[PDB]
């Protein structure tokens, strides 16, 4: 919920949190895209390759 004059919420430390939009009045929310650190598990390459 926003006050009738509140925009550009940070709300944790510095991140641009849920923000309103122009041309309309809705409290949109911004979430970072999915990310992760991939890893590879392998047996001895002298044995196989899968």
């Amino acid at each position: 919920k926003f006050l009738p004059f509140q925009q550009f919420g940070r709300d944790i430390a510095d991140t641009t949190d849920a923000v309103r939009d122009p041309q309309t009045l809705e409290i949109l929310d911004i979430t970072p895209c999915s990310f992760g650190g991939v890893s590879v598990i392998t047996p001895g390459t002298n044995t196989s390759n899968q």
Binding site: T15, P32, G36, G37
Partner: protein, 49 residues
Amino acid sequence: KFNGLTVLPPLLTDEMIAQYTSALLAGTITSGWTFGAGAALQIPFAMQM
């Protein structure tokens, strides 16, 4: 978690740790202390006291 920080879960869950602690307690209460050297033996608790 958003920016760049990730946390990895531990290899052994809490249930496994509880199982090890239960096994140690069960060994101590009946086997005495022979299972700390070799095979587990049995002996009444009063004799161990």
